[PDB]
């Protein structure tokens, strides 16, 4: 008769109309989802709200699971609620899905036992829905698991009884894992929202998820929010200008939650006829300001409220029963006031539990609890439980303590904290940083950035400049604007950093990092700067090249690996080399600095006051055409001693040019990396001439060329020369055969200066090695690796090699293949 799908869609449209879907909205007004501001979705590459489950570019495999992630306050849940409404209205996924079932993790227990009855609880008011009909058809339904990280209590991802069969009742934790791992209702779709930190215990369940990151407001969107929030444009302009003038707060308003907190504060000031003050710079300052205005007009119950929040964190409770409020002395008075001021909610949607408007407020109050004037009241215990799911990670609780524990405090809430306690905690927090900063290990504890966020909140140079002494090496990954302002602050207030690595992510090729580079240029301790493996396109390299010319720069080693630089950037690099007398080592490997780029780069290299000693030009798409300019540099540059030009097309007609100039006995070249240039035996006579005449050359790396036995013979004529000082000769797969063993054998006993001979993956022969074993015993000068790796031998040969190792300890290691 009548369909159910129409009734369910009607229910969803009627229910999902508000942003909060809760009371206490300053007079219990309706927020209206029409107020929703679109958030950008970036695939972990912009994507739409639809097409999330579609097959991708290759293999055409469908996507069952989509995972959305983002920071607290971004609006993961609002997006999920928007999807429910757009679907019910028939504009989103109107074809492929018959039902969307919204699961609110905050309301899901991991203690109780239940069947998959949430297909009933999430349905319209009718207590007996057709669960055994169309609702039971897999692939036509999508579950929305909103707030995975909000699940209260321990969550065990490794279980036996996965519990198939939706009609079977089992533990809430088992049931959630069963849906995520697709054991229950196979082929059903699933959308999960989570904080990035909580992925630690989710990655083991997802198997093959599609990851999407949720972004905050752009400048254009931030402005609209204020104008949509403040119905009077005259007041909207005032509010916008007050915030726009504060660069730090404007940046913070990136997160929807922050701009909301600020807007409410200003709205209250407007109504009361106040000056509309707003001077907050830190996260703590914003939250304190809000509560200061909210609770001052209450504060008499601050202790009880803080104890409630503290208990909720330690005993894993978000939803409070009236009995839990009464037990803290919070009843029939301030609770109503908290609802009126939109600090606390009643969850009036057919329920009688209370909650805080946001987890950051609950954690904020828990942070104050420890400092006021009952599970612990011990900071040590709190910090020891930081890296734990079971306590909610406590990221904001600790972060807020850093902000709250200060000396520059004023009236309203901030003055109700104990001084002696603040002093005791400040010492413990500093020790906490010292240990975590030193313990630079892979873990879920602070990862060299969260510590900066903590120090940022602690706006005190006396504390920050001291805490930063434990960060001699800074390795950070920056994806947003807040990351840059926080890292800039901490790096600037640091006098003991020796090296820095900046992993720029999907925000450079712009001015975004200009402020950070400016700070680095004034450091007197930074020696090594690593900017490899990120999109430092030419525009970014220009900014850096200008930065590196500062008189106080002091950077000696600069690594610019796979940055995707082109030949145009070599103009700016040349300018730096010609004036920067500090830079010693420069790595340009894997860029696209073709022959033209070298022609320009060589201008700086040949310039007076250029002190560069080690230059890497590996895999730079070079050909023999550039050998003339590189050769000129070797001839005239007395400072360049290490040159690596392998993995290029500098064939035999090219190496000959480098050799002709390197042959000159006044050339200071010590190490030459002609690794994979495609050299052939015809050029070995050029290498021979260099080895014979150039007494400075000590290391030659030829692995990857094709020399054969003829090449070895020619090299040996040079290597056996009395003036040859080569110490290390590397000969990996050079297409060698056993016919060259007589000449290699000669080197082993005739050479006086060779120390290492790394024969690698080639058909050297077992008989060849046996020859070496016998001659190596005759007072050989070889002390280092003899190679013979990546090849296989028979039993007797391997025994001989093992014997050689024991009979003549002077040889570091033989390196048998097995």
Ligand X SMILES: Nc1ncnc2c1ncn2[C@@H]1O[C@H](COP(=O)(O)OP(=O)(O)OP(=O)(O)O)[C@@H](O)[C@H]1O
Ligand Y SMILES: CN1CCC[C@@H](Nc2nnc(-c3ccc(C(F)(F)F)cc3O)c3c2CCCC3)C1
> Binding site membership: which residues?
37, 70-78, 358
Instruction: State the distance between the two ends of the chain, measured CA to CA, in whole angstroms.
Output: 76
Count, residues near ligand X per rule CB under 6 A? 19
Judged by beta carbon, residue 480 or residue 488, the one nearer ligand Y is: 480
3-state secondary structure of 608: coil
Kindly state the smallest distance separating residue 396's Cβ from ligand X, in Å. Answer: 11
CA trace torsion 784, 789, 795, 799 (10° rounding): 10
Find how far residue 82's CA is from the centre of its chain: 29
Kindly state the smallest distance separating residue 541's Cβ from ligand Y, in Å. Answer: 27
Residue 78 binds what, of ligand Y, ligand X, none (CB under 5 to 8 Å, by partner type)?
A: ligand X
Q: Is 188 in the site for ligand X (CB under 6 A)?
A: no
Beta-carbon-side half-sphere exposure of residue 581 (alpha carbons within 13 Å): 4
Residue 172 binds what, of ligand Y, ligand X, none (CB under 5 to 8 Å, by partner type)?
A: none
Angle subtended at Cα 761 by Cα 755 and Cα 763, rounded to the nearest 5 degrees:
105
- Listed residue (261, 266, 257, 265) closest to 236, CA to CA: 266
> Which residue's CB comes closest to ligand X?
75
Q: Is 302 in the site for ligand X (CB under 6 A)?
A: no
* Near ligand X by CB under 6 A: residue from 257, 451, 548, 657: 257
From residue 669 to residue 708, what is the string marking binding to ligand X with x (rule CB under 6 A)?
----------------------------------------
Kindly state the smallest distance separating residue 466's Cβ from ligand X, in Å. Answer: 34
Residue 480 binds what, of ligand X, ligand Y, none (CB under 5 to 8 Å, by partner type)?
A: ligand Y
252-260, 347-355, 683-691, 761-769 -> range binding ligand X (CB under 6 A): 252-260
3-state secondary structure of 403: helix
* Near ligand X by CB under 6 A: residue from 19, 242, 295, 741: 19
Judged by beta carbon, residue 256 or residue 265, the one nearer ligand X is: 256
Angle subtended at Cα 248 by Cα 247 and Cα 252, rounded to the nearest 5 degrees:
115
Residues that bind ligand Y (CB under 6 A): 71-73, 255, 257-258, 283, 360, 395, 449-450, 480, 482
Residue 450 binds what, of ligand Y, ligand X, none (CB under 5 to 8 Å, by partner type)?
A: ligand Y
Contact between 813 and 805 under an 8 Å Cβ cutoff? The reply is: yes
- Listed residue (129, 131, 144) closest to 78, CA to CA: 144
In the beta sheet, which residues pair with residue 152? Answer: 109
Residue 75 binds what, of ligand X, ligand Y, none (CB under 5 to 8 Å, by partner type)?
A: ligand X
**Phi, psi dihedrals of residue 356, rounded to the nearest 5°:** -80, 150
Judged by beta carbon, residue 394 or residue 433, the one nearer ligand X is: 394
Residue 77 binds what, of ligand Y, ligand X, none (CB under 5 to 8 Å, by partner type)?
A: ligand X
Kindly state the smallest distance separating residue 192's Cβ from ligand X, in Å. Answer: 12
Residue 35 binds what, of ligand X, ligand Y, none (CB under 5 to 8 Å, by partner type)?
A: ligand X
517-542 as b/e, with b when 16 or more CB fall inside 10 Å? Answer: bebbbebeebebbbbbebebbbebbe
Kindly state the smallest distance separating residue 481's Cβ from ligand Y, in Å. Answer: 8
Judged by beta carbon, residue 154 or residue 449, the one nearer ligand Y is: 449
**Phi, psi dihedrals of residue 29, rounded to the nearest 5°:** -80, 170
* Near ligand X by CB under 6 A: residue from 5, 10, 35, 438: 35
Determine whether 722 is exposed, middle or buried from the number of CB atoms within 10 Å of its CB (0-12, 13-18, 19+).
exposed
DSSP 130-160: -TTTGGG-TTSEEEEEE-GGG-BS---S--S
Kindly state the smallest distance separating residue 359's Cβ from ligand Y, in Å. Answer: 9
Cα(157)–Cα(152) distance, integer angstroms: 14
Of 347-406, binders to ligand X (CB under 6 A) are 358-359
Kindly state the smallest distance separating residue 661's Cβ from ligand Y, in Å. Answer: 51
Q: Is 265 in the site for ligand X (CB under 6 A)?
A: no
- Listed residue (681, 671, 677, 757) closest to 715, CA to CA: 681
Of 43-102, binders to ligand X (CB under 6 A) are 72-78
Judged by beta carbon, residue 153 or residue 594, the one nearer ligand X is: 153
Kindly state the smallest distance separating residue 62's Cβ from ligand X, in Å. Answer: 28
3-state secondary structure of 354: strand
Cα(802)–Cα(787) distance, integer angstroms: 14
Residues near ligand X (CB under 6 A) are 19-20, 35-37, 39, 72-78, 147, 256-257, 260, 358-359
């Amino acid at each position: 008769k009548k369909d159910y799908r129409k009734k369910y869609r009607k229910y969803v449209r009627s229910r999902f109309q508000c942003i909060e879907d809760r009371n206490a909205r300053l007079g219990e007004s309706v927020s209206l989802n029409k107020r929703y501001t679109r958030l950008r979705l970036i695939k972990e590459s912009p994507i739409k709200m639809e097409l999330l489950f579609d097959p991708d570019d290759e293999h055409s495999e469908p996507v069952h699971t989509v995972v959305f992630q983002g920071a607290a306050g971004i609006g993961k849940t609002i997006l999920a609620r928007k999807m429910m409404l757009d679907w019910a209205s028939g504009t989103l996924y109107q074809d492929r899905f018959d039902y969307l079932f919204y699961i609110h993790c905050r309301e899901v227990s991991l203690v109780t036992q239940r069947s998959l009855g949430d297909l009933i609880m999430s349905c319209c008011p009718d207590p007996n829905p057709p669960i055994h009909k169309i609702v039971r058809k897999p692939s036509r339904i999508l579950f929305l698991m909103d707030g995975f990280d909000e699940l209260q209590g321990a969550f065990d991802e490794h279980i036996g009884p996965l519990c198939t069969d939706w009609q079977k009742a089992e533990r809430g934790d088992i049931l959630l894992s069963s849906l995520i791992r697709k054991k229950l209702l196979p082929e059903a779709s699933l959308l999960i929202t989570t904080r990035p930190v909580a992925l630690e215990k989710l990655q083991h369940l997802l198997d093959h998820p599609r990851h999407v990151e949720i972004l905050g407001f752009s400048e254009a969107k931030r402005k609209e929010y204020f104008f949509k929030y403040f119905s009077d444009e005259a007041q909207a302009r005032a509010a916008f200008s007050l915030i726009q003038e504060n660069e730090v707060l404007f940046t913070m308003c990136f997160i929807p939650l922050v701009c909301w907190i600020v807007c409410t504060g200003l709205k209250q000031q407007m109504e009361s006829g106040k000056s509309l003050a707003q001077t907050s710079k830190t996260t703590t300052a914003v939250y304190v300001f809000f509560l200061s205005s909210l609770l001052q007009p209450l504060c008499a119950h601050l202790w009880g409220l803080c104890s409630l929040a503290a208990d909720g964190i330690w005993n894993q409770k978000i939803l409070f029963e009236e009995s839990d409020l009464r037990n803290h002395g919070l009843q029939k008075a301030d609770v109503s006031a908290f609802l009126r001021m939109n600090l606390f909610q009643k969850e009036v949607d057919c329920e009688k539990f209370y909650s805080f408007i946001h987890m950051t407020f609950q954690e904020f109050f828990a942070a104050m609890y420890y400092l006021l004037e009952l599970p612990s009241r011990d900071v040590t215990v709190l910090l020891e439980n930081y890296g734990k799911f079971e306590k909610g990670y406590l990221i904001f609780v600790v972060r807020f303590l850093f902000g709250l524990v200060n000396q520059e405090r004023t009236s309203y809430l901030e003055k109700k904290l104990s001084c002696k306690i603040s002093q005791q905690i400040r010492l413990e927090l500093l020790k906490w940083i010292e240990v975590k900063a030193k313990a630079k290990k892979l873990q879920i504890q602070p990862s060299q950035l969260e510590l900066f966020y903590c120090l940022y909140e602690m706006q005190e140079e006396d504390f920050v400049q001291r805490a930063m002494d434990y960060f001699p090496k800074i390795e950070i990954n920056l994806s947003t604007r807040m990351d840059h302002m926080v890292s800039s602050f901490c790096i600037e207030n640091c006098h003991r950093v020796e090296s820095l690595s900046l992993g720029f992510l999907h925000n450079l090729t712009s001015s975004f990092c200009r402020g950070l580079f400016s700070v680095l240029s004034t450091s007197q301790s930074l020696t090594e700067l690593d900017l490899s493996d990120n999109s430092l396109g030419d525009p970014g390299m220009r900014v850096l090249c200008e930065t590196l010319q500062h008189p106080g720069c002091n950077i000696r080693r600069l690594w610019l690996g796979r940055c995707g630089l082109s030949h145009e950037c070599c103009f700016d690099i040349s300018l730096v080399l010609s004036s920067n007398q500090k830079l010693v080592e420069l790595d340009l490997s894997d860029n696209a600095l073709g022959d033209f780029g070298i022609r320009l780069l060589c201008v700086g290299l040949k310039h007076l006051l250029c002190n560069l000693k080690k230059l890497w030009l590996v895999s730079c798409c070079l050909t023999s055409a550039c050998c003339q300019d590189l050769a000129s540099v070797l001839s005239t540059s007395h400072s360049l001693t290490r040159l690596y030009v392998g993995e290029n097309a500098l064939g035999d007609s090219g190496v000959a040019i480098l050799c002709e100039k390197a042959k000159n006995p006044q050339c200071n070249l010590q190490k030459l990396g002609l690794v994979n240039s495609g050299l052939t035996s015809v050029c070995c006579s050029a290498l021979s001439s260099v080895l014979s005449t150039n007494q400075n050359l000590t290391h030659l790396y030829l692995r990857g060329n094709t020399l054969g036995d003829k090449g070895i013979k020619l090299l040996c004529e040079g290597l056996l020369h009395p003036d040859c000082k080569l110490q290390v000769l590397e000969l990996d797969n050079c297409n060698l055969t056993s016919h060259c063993c007589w000449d290699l054998s000669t080197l082993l006993t005739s050479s006086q200066s060779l120390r290492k001979l790394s024969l690698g993956n080639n058909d050297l022969g077992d008989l060849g090695v046996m020859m070496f074993c016998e001659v190596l015993k005759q007072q050989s000068c070889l002390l280092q690796n003899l190679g013979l790796s990546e090849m296989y031998f028979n039993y007797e040969t391997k025994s001989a090699l093992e014997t050689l190792q024991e009979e003549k300890p002077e040889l570091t290691v033989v390196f048998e293949p097995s």
